[PDB]
Amino acid sequence: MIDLIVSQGRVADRAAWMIEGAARTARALEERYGLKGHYVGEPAPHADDDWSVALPQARETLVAVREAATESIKGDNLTVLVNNTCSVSLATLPVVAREHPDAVVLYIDGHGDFNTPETTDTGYLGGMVLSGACGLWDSGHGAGLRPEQAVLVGSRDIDEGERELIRKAGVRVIPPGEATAQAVLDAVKDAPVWIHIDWDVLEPGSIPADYTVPDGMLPAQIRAVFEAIPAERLIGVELAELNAPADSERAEQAVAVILDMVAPAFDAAAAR
Ligand SMILES: [Mg+2]
Ligand SMILES: [Mn+2]
Ligand SMILES: [Mn+2]
């Protein structure tokens, strides 16, 4: 079955509605699959603070997410985290790497999220997540993920400095036009799999786009990844960064697309 964990505490959020988007996503999953989420953290307003300030402010939420994710990863269920920001994964990815040293992390994101304190232009913690989990800088929440076990999927238009950090560390990049289900399967080989998704990977949703080549990933491409990873190899899934207000029609439509993308994996886990 499925363990649902939901972050509702601020972790460096610079957008207004990502805590609300996580709540609405969790509600849709609860209703579809008959679950009750474990909600962690207290909402706080978004701000443009430096990572050196936002990171300590988030410690209580990050520690609580780490503890809940550890219990779930140690048990027998599919671990599903619905997170306001990618930065929640500074707490979860070190657990995955410790418990499953052979796991491959598919980090599905329009960005590389691979800046360090030395290379960030904006100071935003959310742009430093994968590099922190891989130990290029010290988040205070551990590291241990081998860059050789991390695969960026859907990333594009990466700053040339950050792209070479990625290359030197050994992180593979599969851009949207290469991100077929088989390309992702070939990257994972026989490994167990952790899937992390930032919804900014998606092509902006003017779906009447039959005569133009998309720059982002299409929902069908994400669905095809969830269809291809064998249920017995899937460790867990993190869904992050839906920026949509509570009670908006926009959030209603967004979560319907999300449920369609994740259904192959979640349906299998609920039937395990
Ligand atoms: Mg499991
Ligand atoms: Mn991200
Ligand atoms: Mn992103």
From Swiss-Prot:
A GO cellular-component term linked to this record: cytosol
GO molecular function, one term: arginase activity
CDD domains: Arginase-like_1
Keyword Transmembrane helix: no
EC number in record: 3.5.3.25
Traits of the deletion mutant: Cells lacking this gene do not produce cycloserine (DCS).
Binding site for Mn(2+) 2: D109, H111, D198, D200
Binding-site positions, Mn(2+) 1: D109, D113, D198
Catalytic activity: N(omega)-hydroxy-L-arginine + H2O = hydroxyurea + L-ornithine
UniProt keyword terms in alphabetical order: Antibiotic biosynthesis, Hydrolase, Manganese, Metal-binding
Protein name: N(omega)-hydroxy-L-arginine amidinohydrolase
Organism, scientific name: Streptomyces lavendulae
